Amino acid sequence: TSFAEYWNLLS
Amino acid sequence: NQVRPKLPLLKILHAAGAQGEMFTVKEVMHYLGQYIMVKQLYDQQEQHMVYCGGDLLGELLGRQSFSVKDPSPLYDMLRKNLVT
């Protein structure tokens, strides 16, 4: 999992 | 609804390409992620870890690092840096 993908968890 | 970032937060968002003085929280989050990518603050091996201690972002968070899997330090910084 890439940083950009992890950041998509934030909502 | 839209919020107004305080100066040092606004400087971070603009560094990541944001324009203007008001944003949805969704766009504040977008530009903070953009900033971390642009500035290459995440750990290359463990990419949920953001190492912000050498950066204005770390000064603003009051911390040298945080994990994307536990964002409470972002919520704190945001509560202190958004004029609603």
CB within 8 Å of B5: residues ≥ 6 apart? B13, B21, B23, B28, B81, B82, B83
The residue range of the domain holding B59 is: 1-84
Task: State the smallest CA–CA distance between residue A2 and chain B in angstroms.
Answer: 6
Q: Tokens 């509560």, residue?
A: B79
CATH of the domain at B8: 1.10.245.10
How many inter-chain contacts (A to B, CB under 8 Å) are there? 26
Put simply, the answer to whether A4 touches B33 (Cβ < 8 Å) is yes
The resolution of the experimental structure, rounded to one decimal in Å, is 1.5
Q: How many CB atoms lie within 10 A of CB B67?
A: 14
Both tokens assigned to B47: 């990419």
DSSP designation for B53: T
Q: How far off is chain B from A6, nearest CA to CA, in Å?
A: 6
Q: Which two tokens stand for residue B22?
A: 């008001």
Find chain A residues with C-beta within 8 A of B36's C-beta: 3, 7
Burial class (CB in 10 A: 0-12, 13-18, 19+), B45: exposed
B28 with B5: CB under 8 angstroms? yes
